[PDB]
Structure formats: C-alpha cells, structure tokens
Amino acid sequence: NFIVLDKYIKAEPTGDSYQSESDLERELIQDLRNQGYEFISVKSQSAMLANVREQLQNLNGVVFNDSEWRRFTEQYLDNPSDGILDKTRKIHIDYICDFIFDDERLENIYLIDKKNLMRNKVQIIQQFENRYDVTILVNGLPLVQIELKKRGVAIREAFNQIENSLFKYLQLFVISNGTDTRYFANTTKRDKNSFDFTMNWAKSDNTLIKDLKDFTATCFQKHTLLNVLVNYSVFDSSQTLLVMRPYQIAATERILWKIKSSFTAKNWSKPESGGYIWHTTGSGKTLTSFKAARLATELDFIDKVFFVVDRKDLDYQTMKEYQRFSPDSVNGSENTAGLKRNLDKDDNKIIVTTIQKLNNLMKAESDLPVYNQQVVFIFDECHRSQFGEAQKNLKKKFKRYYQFGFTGTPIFPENALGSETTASVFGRELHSYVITDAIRDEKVLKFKVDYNDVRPQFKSLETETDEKKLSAAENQQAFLHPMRIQEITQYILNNFRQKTHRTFPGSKGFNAMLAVSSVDAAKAYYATFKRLQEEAANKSATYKPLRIATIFSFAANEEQNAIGEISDETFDTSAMDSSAKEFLDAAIREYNSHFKTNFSTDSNGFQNYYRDLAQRVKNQDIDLLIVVGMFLTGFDAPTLNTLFVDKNLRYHGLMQAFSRTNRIYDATKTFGNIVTFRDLERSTIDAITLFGDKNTKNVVLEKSYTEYMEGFTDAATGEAKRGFMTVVSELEQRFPDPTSIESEKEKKDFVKLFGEYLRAENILQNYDEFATLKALQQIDLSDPVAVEKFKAEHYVDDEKFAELQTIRLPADRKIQDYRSAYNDIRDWQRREKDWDDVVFEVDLLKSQEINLDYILGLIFEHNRGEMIEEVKRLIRSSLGNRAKEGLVVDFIQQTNLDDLPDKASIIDAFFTFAQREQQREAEALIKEENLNEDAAKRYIRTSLKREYATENGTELNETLPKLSPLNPQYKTKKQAVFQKIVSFIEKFKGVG
Amino acid sequence: LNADLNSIFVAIESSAYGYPSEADIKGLFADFDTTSNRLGNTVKDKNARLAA
Amino acid sequence: IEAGTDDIKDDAIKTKGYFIYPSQLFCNVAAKANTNDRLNADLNSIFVAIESSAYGYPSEADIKGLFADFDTTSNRLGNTVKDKNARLAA
Amino acid sequence: NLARMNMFLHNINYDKFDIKLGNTLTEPHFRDEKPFDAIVSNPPYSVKWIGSDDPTLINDERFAPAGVLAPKSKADFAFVLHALNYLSAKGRAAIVCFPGIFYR
C-alpha cells in the first residue's frame, strides 16, 4: 500500500554463509526470485540489446525490424557522443522518443511507465566485468548495481575500488558488507567526501534498518523500488540528482494518502481532512515541500495549490525552488490583481504567496472563482500576527481546502496556553521526524549545556527561578552589575581561545556568539569588552585582542510568539533613543574605520549592513558577536562551536538558539559548548521530555567530566570507552616507548591506540577542568602570588587543588615522541602507497599546527647557557610540516643567535636567508639537467604563487631540455625533474 | 478533437494526416500536408506547445 | 609530435601510455591516422560521414578538465549522400 | 561555439582557459572564482529583460547596493553593476556604453 511500511517482522541468517560473498549473492538472487524478479543469464554486449528489443516490444506493443532496431539504437538510444548526464536526463525527463515505422508513420517509444508502475518488467543479472556485481534491469535497463565486500571491510574502503557502453545508465550504487547497507548516486566525490551522501533505509519511526537481508526484503519490492527510482529522484538542473532520505518520502505518501481518503470521504475543509507534518529543523524540509507540491500538481482533480511562509523567506526560497526547470514559481509582489490573474492564468500549478498577500487578497476581494474549487494549502514558519485571523478568513471566505503544516513549533501541551493548538489547527500528527535520530544519523551534533556557578555574590540571583521577579526586578544593578559583567567578561576572555580551539598559533579556530535579553546590557558590554581588552593589552604588551562586533535595531515589539521564543526585531532604525541608536552608529563608524566599509545606519545601509556582517562573521574573520535578538532562527554558521548565554529561555525558542551551533563541519567539531551564566538545564530537560523520554536526553547531550576521564561503559550498547588515564596507562605499560615497535601488527595496534587517544583528547579539549589540569603542567615553586592568581583565574580552591596536584598527566615530550612516531608510520605507509586496513586520524594531524612563528619565538627565547641541544629541541618539535626541516637547521647551524637581537629580527633574517638559499638551490635545479632558464624560472614562480606544482601547465616542455615529440620519450627527464621540483616546492610552500 | 484538448498525447495529428491522404481515387491532389514536423525538444514541450 | 622524425603519413604505433600524455598536455590525441594530412590523401573517397566519427576522437577527453563537447556544428543538409560527398569533399 | 574556437586558434594554453555559457543577469558565475583584477566588455544596447523583476534580484549581492534595478528600456547598467561586483581591491576596469544613457 505504502512505500515505508511500519509493521515488519525480521529474518535471520547464520548461515547461509557467515563470511562469503557468492553465497550471499545466491541468497539475494533467491530472495528476489521469491519477490518476483526474473533471474536470466546474459553474458555479452549484444545480447543485452537483444534483451532490450525483447522488452521494449512488450512495453510499447510494437514490432521493430532489424534495420529499424539498428536505427533506434543509433539515432536515439546509444549515440556514443553522449555522457552519463545525458542518459540521466533521458531516464528522468526524456523518457519518450518518436520513431518512424517503415510503413511511413511516427509513433511513441516509452522507456519507463511513469504513470503505471506495475506494467513495468523487472530482471536481475550477475557480474561482468575486479569485484562482484549484481545488476537489476528495469525493463531491461541497468539502473541498480550492488557490490559485495567481506564482513570486516570498513565502510570507508567500500568506495576505494574506483567502457563498457551500456553501463552508463546506473543511478543507485548500493554497497554493503552484509551487516550495513547504504546507497550512492551520481558517483559524486572521492572517499574523502562520500560520507555526506550515505543514506539508510529505515522504518517510519526513524529506527534504522541495516541488515542486507531485510534491507532487500523491505526496500527492494517492485512497487517500492520503481516508485523510489521514478518518483523520488530529482534531477536538479543541472549536473545533480537529488535523491531523498526515507522519512521525507514517508511523509509525502502520508500527505497524499490523507488527501485521497479525505476526498473519497468528501470530508474537506476540516481538521479531520487536515493534519500536520512536524519534522525537526535541519532535515531539509524545502525539497520535501517541493515534492509534495509537484505531486499535488500531478494529482487528478486538484485545481490550485499554495505554499505559504513568513516574510521575506519567500522569494529567496522561490528562486531556490528551481528543482523543476521551469518550476512556475510565480509571485504578484504585491499584486492581488496579479495574483488573481495567476488564478486566471492556467498551468502555473504551484503558487507561492505570503500570509499577508493572501489576507490582502481576501479582505480586498471576496468574489473569486477559487472559492468553490479544489484547493491545497501548505504553511510554514508561523508567527503570531495572523495565526488565527487569517485562518478565520480562511474559514470564512473558502469552501474546499486541504490545509497542512510544516513546523518545528508544536503548540499543544504547554507552548502557547492561550491559542488554538497545532492538532486543533491542523489535525493528526501525520508524520514526524524528531531531532533525536537525526542526531544519531550524524546530521547535527550534540550538546554540552553548563551553567557558570562562579560568583558567590550573585549566586542566589543567578540560581533564582522566580519568573515573576526575574521578569520584573531585572535591572542594571542586581542583574547587570559592573563587577558581575566584569567577571563575565574575564571568564569569557580567559576561556575563548581554549573553547575555540585556539590554543596554538597555527590552529584553525572558531567564532563565538554572546546573546542576552536587554539592550542596555549590550551598551554596557561593548565598552566593557573594549576597555578590558585595552587593559589586558596594557598589562604586558603581549595580549592578542579580539575583534568584537554587535548588531540590533528594534525591538521586543509585540508578543509575536508562544512561550517562549525571540520576539522579532523590526527594521525601524532610530526607534530607540540615540543613546542606543547613535551608540550603534558610533560602533559602526569604528567598524568602518577598521574594515573600510560604507554602510550608514539609514533605512538602506543598515539592512545590507546586517547582511554584510552576517556574511563576514561566517568566514571566521570576526572573533566575537554580541547579539540582542538577531541571528537566532534563520542564520546558519557551520564554523561556530560555542554559544554563551546570559538570558532565561523556554521550551523550543531555546532549541532554536541551540540549533545555532550543532551543525556538522568535520571531525574536529564534535558538540556545541553551551555556556550559560544563568541556570537553564531544567528548561532543557523540559524541552527533551517534551520531545522524548528520559533516554532521549542521554542520547542527546553529554556525560559528566569523570565519565569521560576514566571513560565509561555505555548502558545501551556495552562499548568499552576505556578512558583518558586508562589509555595513558595502556600506552605506557604495553609499549616500551618511544620507538621499540618493529613488528607490523604491533605498529598497527600502536597506531590504533594512539588514534583512540587523540580522539579522546579532542573530546576532552572542551572541558574546563581538563583545561585547568593541562595548564597545571606549568607549576611554580613557589611563586605563591602567581599560583594563587592562576587558581583564581580557574576558580580553584586548594581543597580540589590537592587532588589536582595528586592526579598526574603523561609527559609532553613523550607525546611529542608519539606524534612523531605516528607521523613516521604514516609517511612509511605513504611510500607504497596487512596495511590496507589502518584507520588514519588525518584531521587532528591537520589540526594543532605551528607555522614557524612559535618555533622562532622559542628559538629567540632559547637562551643563549644552552646553545647546542636547543637545535635538538627544535628537531624534536619538527613534525607536521617537517619537510622544511634541515634548512631551518641551516639557518641556525650557520648564523649566530647573538647576531639576532629579538623575535622580529630573527624572523625576517630567516626570511632573507630562506630566499637566498632558495635562489641558490634553484640555480642548481637549473644547472643539473639542462633547464631552460626563463621558462623554468617562470614555471617555478607560477607553482610557488600557486602553492603546489602539477604535470599540467602544459607549456612545461619549454622548461624541458631537448625534445619530447619522440615516441621514445621515457619520462626523460620529465619524472625526475618533476619529482625534484615537487620536493622543492614542498620545501618552500609559501616561504620565499 | 477540440473536446479532448491538452490530452496526452498530441502526435495522433500525424496519423490524422494519414486520413485525407488516402485519396487515390480519383485525381489525388494529396501528398501535401508534410509541414507540421516535430521540433520540439521533449514530448511534453510538443504537447503543451501544439495544444496552446 | 614530430618536431624533429617528421612524417607526412603516420603509423598505428599503438602505445597508449605515450598517447595519454598529449591527452594530458593538449588534452586530445588527434588519432593515429585520422589526421587531416592522412585524410587529405583519400579525398573524394566514398564516404564522407567518417568525419562524424572523427569528432568522436578528440571528444573523449575526460581526463582532465575536458573543455570538449564542442564540435557539433557540421550537421548534414544535404539532400542525397552523393551531394554530401561531393560538397564536403569540395 | 565560435568564441571557443576563436580563443582556441591563437595558440593559447589549455590551463584553465575557457568561457561558460549563460547570461550574467540570470546565471552570474563565477562568484567563487574570483574577485577579478581586470575586465573589459562590449555589452549590447537596449537589451530589455524580465521585469521588474519577478524574482528577488533586487536582494542579490550586486543590485542591493545600488538601490533599484535596471528596467526594460534602460537595461544597460545591470552589466556595469555586474562588472564592478567582480573587481579586486586595486585593479581597474573598463567598459563601453553609448552616451545616450545620460540621465534617463
């Protein structure tokens, strides 16, 4: 009946071979022959065409001739001058050709029955011709390919195995190990970026289905697979085939099932006929909305279809609706005469309009022909201006409507308390996609929500929960005190470069936001941060400051929402006083003075100023963003890990705030650090118990500090998360360190252990006690003022400091040795090329970089005393960018540190010496193998400004000595020159 | 045919031109109506355009 | 390919590994023998439509950064095959 | 097509050397590559386009700094706005027009 079926009993092989592939292949052959897929045996290229002639004559009910079948193969079906994208266009759009029958006529040729799927015919065949292949023929057309692996094959290695003619039709690259099973499209990227497009079939409650047997038994029904492959595969113009995730298809079929049942019952214009879809944000609801709109277009008896959002999301997504080409994404803007003309105009079968345009149309015009017609409505992003009143006009001035909703905002139990709820506005919860299993399926990240119980002065007022007094007695002194704001500022400026992973100079970094509930707080904050950064820079003339920006206009204007969200700011510039407005203007003038921009604070430059600030906060060129009420709902930031709150929030406006961190970026970013200065964890428990059970919050957030220190055993899956000090003791005791590992299996096991160690390290990096423990490795004996000031920075009483002195960390020089050993093992397996199994932690090698500035800073600090073994310390630290190794030694083994007074003198002396040695060695590169001087110098300077080299730059023969016309060109000396120059540009990446 | 306008498909008009082109008795004056060819890039383009 | 032994007529030397290097450099092998100067010997020879297949040869070019999919200009009209042969040969 | 063969005849390197097909008012590419350093052009005159406009092309990255679009009979300066969008911090630009676009 449906595509995503709920009630499914499962099977169990043991078997029925445990390990092999060919027996699993025979299993799935048996299963598809049980389901009704025909297993025939074709072995040649021409017998494929014979099978296609067998099937298309069955389909179209016509008879070819041999010359006619040849002419159809040549002219339309298999022109060899066409690529994969052409045939994708054919199977998704151009599925009908027109063919001349030899009795001088012209009739149609189908490919797939796009409207009667059961009339299609299915076949299954086997491999030809480095792997195992199982192919499904859809009316004799190869579209679904299934490979096989061993049991312990990693899912990353499942892609690394990458003429003939008719294998350029395939769309679904289903891959499996027999335990997990996924499916590709478009053969998009390399193995580095395949995991973005790895999907899973599941049931409609989002509980995953991974076993290949029941994956085949459920997802590979004929009525299932044909409907998936035809109806839910959008060829977005151009180059792209967007194929969904199963909950979207499930929601769409629930929508149309309810529509068809409501029309058969003739029960329209009622919440029985209504209902709603509540999917979490981040699930890609726009493509699902478009699919519902296109299928409502494809419906039989439907006159008009409408899709309504809030302003001014509309025209932006309207040009983002270009999946269809052209998609008839029409607007009046704001033409009620134009909108009724579009009503009068035919076959713009989707219309997008606002609630305000619809309300203007209804209150301005009450005699439309649409009032007794089959009308479908879909709504999204409901604020509280016309949330009931336009719905009262909808009830009044219409007769036949099917109203549906997309939202992330449920209303029913405790949200609004004074309005018509979602289930009473719309009806049944038709299908839902909660945040939980989306977090489980790696679409967004986890939470760590902590309150900063750090000030015993305002401890009662921070921990106060009296909502009446927190609403009313909120002031500028009992809750915005200058000492309180000052210590908030000192906390965040101490913990910024720790929580943004900026502990190293060559680190990547992340930006952060700080949102509050009152404007006068922010007017205090900007001058507060500015003056305290001035004082921090004046403490020792060493402190790197932070560019801090802010923006807001006006205001918490109305109620605008339920309990509890952000009241939206309007675009009135100077509605507040100039104590707020000209303050903002002077901040923007300082912004212009630092960044050379032109936006004034008028009715034009302020809005595009907001857009420009939004764009340049995204590229990590703004360190900190102070926020009153913007950047909380519609703004996305993939490079923002840490949010700071001094505000009290509620059910799911707080969820919309927490959505501003949790988006996935890479393996470095793991979860969002929520740091609140007022306790709100019970509100989080409220939101999650609203959105799930008590297991749900343990799925969502976090475990405690010690539960990651010594690790844990997960109560659900029973995994051995061993723990930080545990793995430390393991690597100390098991391996007689540093480089006494020569057996290859123990090399691999040492790699695995060290990778797990750095994984747990990066997880612990966002923890304040772990940061304090790492910074405890800079002890003073005694220097009690500095030690107590350090403990006051990290708020450490001597009681806990006793155990903190007791708990011991591993030695950092040992960790230098371990990371160097891991880099050496990686370089040893970088040569050629049991070793095609090893997990590599590439990302955190790419993290924690030192870009020679901290190196030369240590060398300048390397007094004077020690003078020889400091070169040994620098050869210890040499890793990560180790290929610039020896010449750095050649800067210090040749020159004198007495010649260089300070840091900058030795820095530009290093630049001068590097340029001199680079030119002198480039002379030898010219001299060695007859290099044409101008051409090769041009090539190498092009490569240096390009920061790498290539075997393209195809005028490279002008650099080459004599001759490569000749067929005995034996890479002479092309590979030798090329390897030498890529070693050279690796030696001089960026420098010189 | 004006009743079933916008109806898939449109190429029956080609077969429609088969009908008066029988005309072999007597003195044909046929073999004439080969003007309306097909370009045209998709079948739905052809349907919508010729129906319009 | 012959800046130095220069040959008016060429061979089927078959060495693909050497063939792919102008297919990285100029991105296109012309062919072994489907150059113009070889085709200029067999002018007025039936038939002429091999030029279509000739346009199959540089349009392989998938490695790397194709810049192909270009030469679809010379279509066929044309009313008889001998008209096409005589006209294109002229 | 004749432009690609024209630029291909003059013994120019394969390196990145290309033109893509489309219209700058409808498919402005390439934004990501790059803010350019020098541009010339010959925009055609009186080139009236879709009005005024039905999509949100006021609110793009290049016409929102102006304040208003370029309507049908005055369809010229959309090209020069699209030109000044793709410019470096220092590199100059040069376009052609006819002096009839005077105050208009």
DSSP string, A489-542: HHHHHHHHHHHTT-SSTT----EEEEEES-HHHHHHHHHHHHHHHHHHHHHHS-
Beta strands in A541-653 (DSSP E): 548-551, 624-627, 640-646
In the three-class reduction of DSSP (H, G, I as helix; E, B as strand; rest coil), residue A101 is classed as strand
- Residue A851 and residue A869: Cα distance in Å, rounded? 22
Residue A855, Cβ neighbours under 10 Å: how many?
18
Q: From the CA atom positions of chain A, what is the Rg in Å?
A: 33
- Residue A405 and residue A421: Cα distance in Å, rounded? 12
Structure tokens at A972: 């002479």
Q: Under an 8 A CB cutoff, do A967 and C55 touch?
A: no
Output the CATH code of domain A767-808. Answer: 1.10.10.2110
- Residue A162 and residue A540: Cα distance in Å, rounded? 57
Structure tokens at A259: 């529509």
D93 class by beta-carbon count within 10 Å (0-12 exposed, 13-18 middle, 19+ buried): middle
Q: Under an 8 A CB cutoff, do D59 and A319 touch?
A: no
Domain A1-43+117-242 has CATH 3.90.1570.50: yes
Residue A299, Cβ neighbours under 10 Å: how many?
16
Taking CA atoms, A845 is separated from A283, A508, A725, A763, in Å, by: 31, 12, 22, 15
Q: Under an 8 A CB cutoff, do A94 and B42 touch?
A: yes
Non-local (6+) Cβ contacts of A349 within 8 A are A297, A305, A328
| Chain A residues within an 8 Å CB radius of B18 | 105
Q: Under an 8 A CB cutoff, do C65 and D16 touch?
A: yes
DSSP structure class, residue D39: B
Instruction: Give the pairing type, strands A122-126 and A105-109.
Output: unpaired
Task: Kindly identify which residue of chain C lies nearest to residue A81, measuring between CA atoms.
Answer: C56
* Residues A504, A854 contacting (CB under 8 angstroms): yes
- Residue A224 and residue A280: Cα distance in Å, rounded? 26
* Residues A282, A663 contacting (CB under 8 angstroms): yes
SS3 per-residue string spanning A31-82? HHHHHCCEECCCCCHHHHHHHHHHHHHHHHCCCCCHHHHHHHHHHHHCCCCC
Helix (H) or strand (E) holding A401: strand A401-407
Q: Under an 8 A CB cutoff, do D5 and C70 touch?
A: yes
* Residues A771, A675 contacting (CB under 8 angstroms): no
The residue assigned the tokens 């069955």 is A58
Tell me the shortest Cα–Cα distance from A319 to chain D, in angstroms: 7
- Residue A629 and residue A617: Cα distance in Å, rounded? 16
A906 class by beta-carbon count within 10 Å (0-12 exposed, 13-18 middle, 19+ buried): buried
Residue D51, Cβ neighbours under 10 Å: how many?
12
- Residue A47 and residue A58: Cα distance in Å, rounded? 17
Candidates A751, A669, A761, A645; CA nearest to A708 is A761
Chains near A with 3+ CB pairs less than 8 A apart are B, C, D
Q: From the CA atom positions of chain B, what is the Rg in Å?
A: 13
Chains near D with 3+ CB pairs less than 8 A apart are A, C
Structure tokens at A78: 């298999």
- Residue A778 and residue A190: Cα distance in Å, rounded? 44
Method: cryo-EM
- Residue A115 and residue C36: Cα distance in Å, rounded? 51
DSSP structure class, residue A152: T
Report how far Cα A702 is from the mean position of its chain's Cα atoms: 20
Candidates A829, A813, A816; CA nearest to A879 is A816
Tell me if domain A434-703 and domain A767-808 are identical in fold. Answer: no
Nearest to A319 among D13, D55, D67 (CB): D55
- Residue C15 and residue A20: Cα distance in Å, rounded? 40
The fold of A704-766+809-847 is Methane Monooxygenase Hydroxylase; Chain G, domain 1 (1.20.58)
Instruction: Give the pairing type, strands A142-146 and A172-176.
Output: parallel
Report how far Cα A2 is from the mean position of its chain's Cα atoms: 31
Taking CA atoms, A635 is separated from A162, A333, A500, A638, A648, in Å, by: 38, 24, 20, 10, 21
- Residue A247 and residue A255: Cα distance in Å, rounded? 12
- Residue A516 and residue B16: Cα distance in Å, rounded? 75
Q: Is A266 annotated as a binding residue?
A: no
Ramachandran region, residue C44 (left: φ > 0; alpha: ψ -120 to 50; beta: rest): left
The residue assigned the tokens 């089959």 is A374
The residue assigned the tokens 């033409």 is A335
Q: Using beta carbons and an 8 Å cutoff, which residues of A are at the interface with D?
A: 312, 315-316, 318-319, 330-331, 333, 604, 608, 611, 952-955
| Chain A residues within an 8 Å CB radius of B15 | 105
| Chain A residues within an 8 Å CB radius of D53 | none
Q: Under an 8 A CB cutoff, do D15 and A954 touch?
A: yes
Report the alpha-carbon angle A976-A979-A984, nearest 5. 125
- Residue A617 and residue A547: Cα distance in Å, rounded? 11
Size of the A and D interface in Cβ pairs below 8 Å? 26
- Residue A915 and residue A615: Cα distance in Å, rounded? 37
Candidates A251, A257, A279, A172; CA nearest to A215 is A172
Chain A, 942 to 971: residues with Cβ < 8 Å from chain C are: 951-952, 954, 957, 963, 965-967, 969
Kindly give the residue spans of alpha helices, DSSP state H, lying in A388-441: 389-396, 422-425, 435-440
Q: From the CA atom positions of chain C, what is the Rg in Å?
A: 15
- Residue B5 and residue A974: Cα distance in Å, rounded? 69
Task: Kindly identify which residue of chain A lies nearest to residue C12, measuring between CA atoms.
Answer: A967
Residue A766, Cβ neighbours under 10 Å: how many?
19
Q: In angstroms, how far is the first alpha carbon of chain D from the final one?
A: 35
Cis peptide before A782 (omega within 30 of 0): yes
Taking CA atoms, A131 is separated from A20, A158, A345, B51, C56, in Å, by: 13, 11, 56, 51, 30
Q: What is the DSSP string of C36-78?
A: HHHHTTTTT-S--THHHHHTTTTT---SS----S---------
- Residue A368 and residue A361: Cα distance in Å, rounded? 9
* Residues D72, D48 contacting (CB under 8 angstroms): yes
DSSP structure class, residue A553: -
| Chain A residues within an 8 Å CB radius of C56 | 80-81
* Residues A436, A696 contacting (CB under 8 angstroms): yes
Candidates A634, A701, A697, A649; CA nearest to A671 is A701
- Residue A919 and residue A923: Cα distance in Å, rounded? 6
**Structure resolution in Å?**
4.5
Query: Whats the size of chain A, residue-wise?
Result: 992
A745 class by beta-carbon count within 10 Å (0-12 exposed, 13-18 middle, 19+ buried): exposed
Q: Under an 8 A CB cutoff, do A318 and D56 touch?
A: yes
Half-sphere exposure of B23 (CA within 13 A, CB side): 11
Taking CA atoms, A148 is separated from A34, A159, A177, A179, in Å, by: 21, 11, 6, 11
* Residues A528, A615 contacting (CB under 8 angstroms): no
- Residue D65 and residue A688: Cα distance in Å, rounded? 44
CATH number assigned to the domain with residue range A434-703, chosen from the 4 options 1.10.10.10, 3.40.50.720, 3.40.50.300, 3.30.420.40: 3.40.50.300
B47 class by beta-carbon count within 10 Å (0-12 exposed, 13-18 middle, 19+ buried): middle
Candidates A821, A860, A659, A827; CA nearest to A740 is A821
β-bridge partners, C75: none
In degrees rounded to 5, what are phi and psi of residue A127? -80, 135
Report the alpha-carbon angle A904-A905-A911, nearest 5. 85
Nearest to C27 among D1, D5, D14 (CB): D14
Structure tokens at A807: 């708990």
- Residue D90 and residue A158: Cα distance in Å, rounded? 49
Q: Is A594 annotated as a binding residue?
A: no
Q: Under an 8 A CB cutoff, do A965 and C18 touch?
A: no
In the three-class reduction of DSSP (H, G, I as helix; E, B as strand; rest coil), residue A404 is classed as strand
- Residue A637 and residue A660: Cα distance in Å, rounded? 7
Candidates A939, A887, A933; CA nearest to A913 is A887
- Residue A549 and residue A876: Cα distance in Å, rounded? 41
Report the alpha-carbon angle A304-A308-A312, nearest 5. 140
| Chain A residues within an 8 Å CB radius of B48 | 347
Output the CATH code of domain A44-116. Answer: 3.90.640.50
Q: Is A280 annotated as a binding residue?
A: yes
Q: From the CA atom positions of chain D, what is the Rg in Å?
A: 15
Q: Is A223 annotated as a binding residue?
A: no
- Quick check: A779 contacting B, CB < 8 Å? no
> Nearest 10 degrees: CA dihedral of A121, A127, A129, A130?
140
Half-sphere exposure of A457 (CA within 13 A, CB side): 12
| Chain C residues within an 8 Å CB radius of A967 | 13, 15, 18
DSSP structure class, residue A119: G
Non-local (6+) Cβ contacts of A680 within 8 A are A449, A451, A645, A648, A649, A654
Non-local (6+) Cβ contacts of A876 within 8 A are A813, A816, A817, A820
- Quick check: C59 contacting A, CB < 8 Å? yes
* Residues A309, A380 contacting (CB under 8 angstroms): yes
SS3 per-residue string spanning A246-262? HHHHHHHHHHHHHHHHH
Tell me the shortest Cα–Cα distance from B11 to chain A, in angstroms: 7
- Residue B48 and residue A326: Cα distance in Å, rounded? 14
- Quick check: D11 contacting A, CB < 8 Å? no
Query: Whats the size of chain B, residue-wise?
Result: 52
The residue assigned the tokens 């001299």 is A927
Each domain of chain A, given as residue ranges in start order, spans: 1-43+117-242, 44-116, 243-433, 434-703, 704-766+809-847, 767-808
Taking CA atoms, A203 is separated from A218, A229, A259, A431, D57, in Å, by: 10, 18, 22, 12, 42
Q: Under an 8 A CB cutoff, do A319 and D64 touch?
A: no
- Residue C61 and residue A188: Cα distance in Å, rounded? 19
Q: Under an 8 A CB cutoff, do A98 and B18 touch?
A: no
- Residue A381 and residue D76: Cα distance in Å, rounded? 38
- Residue A141 and residue A124: Cα distance in Å, rounded? 10
- Quick check: B30 contacting A, CB < 8 Å? no
Half-sphere exposure of A257 (CA within 13 A, CB side): 13
Instruction: Give the pairing type, strands A181-183 and A172-176.
Output: antiparallel
- Quick check: C55 contacting A, CB < 8 Å? yes
Q: In angstroms, how far is the first alpha carbon of chain B from the final one?
A: 14
Q: Which of A168, A190, A960, A967 best probes binding to C when mutated, by most C CB atoms within 10 angstroms?
A: A967
Q: Using beta carbons and an 8 Å cutoff, which residues of C are at the interface with D?
A: 25-27, 65, 67, 70, 73
- Residue A3 and residue A218: Cα distance in Å, rounded? 9
Q: Under an 8 A CB cutoff, do D54 and A330 touch?
A: yes
Q: Under an 8 A CB cutoff, do A108 and B38 touch?
A: no
Report how far Cα D9 is from the mean position of its chain's Cα atoms: 25
Taking CA atoms, C62 is separated from C28, C33, C58, in Å, by: 10, 21, 10
Cis peptide before A227 (omega within 30 of 0): no
> Nearest 10 degrees: CA dihedral of A278, A284, A290, A295?
-60
Superfamily of domain A243-433: P-loop containing nucleotide triphosphate hydrolases (3.40.50.300)
In degrees rounded to 5, what are phi and psi of residue A939? -65, -45
A509 class by beta-carbon count within 10 Å (0-12 exposed, 13-18 middle, 19+ buried): middle
Structure tokens at A670: 């793991």
- Residue A692 and residue A669: Cα distance in Å, rounded? 25
